[PDB]
Symmetry: C2
């Protein structure tokens, strides 16, 4: 597959995108973020593979950044593949309590840290994490970046160009619209929503996602 | 999600296996089981060794003898059902080119292989043909004279497909020429089975040319 791409999307916020070859279908992209605070770096979702995680770490360290932590937004592999490698480098890895326990139940590498409430911050205010309820998975969380006004929605949100909800084998479809409404209730002054797959868009990505969820729910 | 097998004609069964793609949804992949009396031939295996196991179980529970498999190209998916069949002493066939491509990539290799651009399997049951590069450099197709079905694998796209699929190893500018070589065989095609998506008519070929020429620009 083609290798990790990293592109600046705001002052101190970079989009990292990994790619998978899907036989029969084509190339599929997966997004996360790197957030900088002076020379400290925080990774929101790892890349989709251990080797693209290695490239992400090298991106940061070649720039003289110290990688302080990762947070993964649910237990699925496009969010967590790199937890094994970061653990091996002694980089703190974080999920929610629920995500950590799901990983453990499945015999997957676990983060070295977790948070218990519906809200938590990383980087002492830099990244606000929120659990809005089930949708894409029972455990999906979102990250709000108050300085850049970026909401990282992960797979709980769908890009404009997405006509469906994606992989729903672990989804709670009938809960999903309510969980997006919970995000809206936070009154974040969102100017960009970053989905787990596809292109970055505005806050109207939330309304789009509600439409898809309500349609599927029937 | 587990294997599905369904009859699409007397003696011909469609097997469809599924992958969970984690930002897109479920992706299906097709192959065939072709019967001559109780003797069964597999055209492409499920992309999983675990689904191939189930396809073999499907055949032998019905009391069929699995005579051979044929693989249409060297991609990770439709092979290493090769590994499994090899282990059960079931002959596995590919083109010689496909065989060497696998061997070069250190993948499991078929025990059997054919040299020319044409080969017939099962006493006239299955006709294999190499039309040129397209989805891949080595892709072959299988023609079934009895049922008048062409298995196009990923060289052909379903009527519903809007793109050529995974094009990483494609010869896009060679692709329309290769479909043309299939048309040039003048097979009395009643159906075409794509590697992905719904089975359809011979117009699936024209559709594929249209995607290929379009892409070529
Ligand atoms: Zn997921
Ligand atoms: Zn292929």
């Amino acid at each position: 597959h083609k290798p990790l791409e990293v592109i600046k999307i705001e002052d101190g916020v970079y989009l990292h995108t990994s790619f998978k070859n899907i036989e029969g279908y084509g190339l599929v992209d997966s997004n996360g973020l790197v957030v900088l605070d002076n020379n400290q770096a925080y990774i929101i979702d790892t890349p989709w593979s251990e080797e693209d995680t290695k490239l992400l770490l090298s991106w940061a360290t070649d720039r003289g950044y110290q990688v302080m932590a990762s947070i993964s937004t649910h237990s699925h592999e496009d969010r967590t593949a790199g937890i094994k490698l970061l653990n091996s480098k002694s980089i703190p890895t974080y999920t929610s309590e629920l995500t950590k326990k799901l990983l453990a139940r499945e015999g997957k590498p676990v983060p070295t840290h977790y948070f218990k409430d519906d809200e938590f911050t990383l980087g002492n205010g830099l990244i606000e994490l929120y659990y809005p309820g089930a949708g894409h998975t029972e455990d999906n969380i979102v990250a709000w970046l108050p300085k850049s006004k970026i909401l990282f929605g992960g797979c709980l949100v769908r890009s404009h160009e997405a006509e469906g909800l994606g992989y729903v084998g672990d989804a709670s479809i009938s809960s999903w619209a309510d969980s997006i409404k919970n995000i809206v209730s936070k009154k974040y002054p969102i100017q960009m929503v970053v989905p787990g797959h596809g292109k970055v868009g505005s806050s109207d990505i939330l309304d789009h996602t509600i439409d898809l969820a309500e349609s599927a729910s029937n």
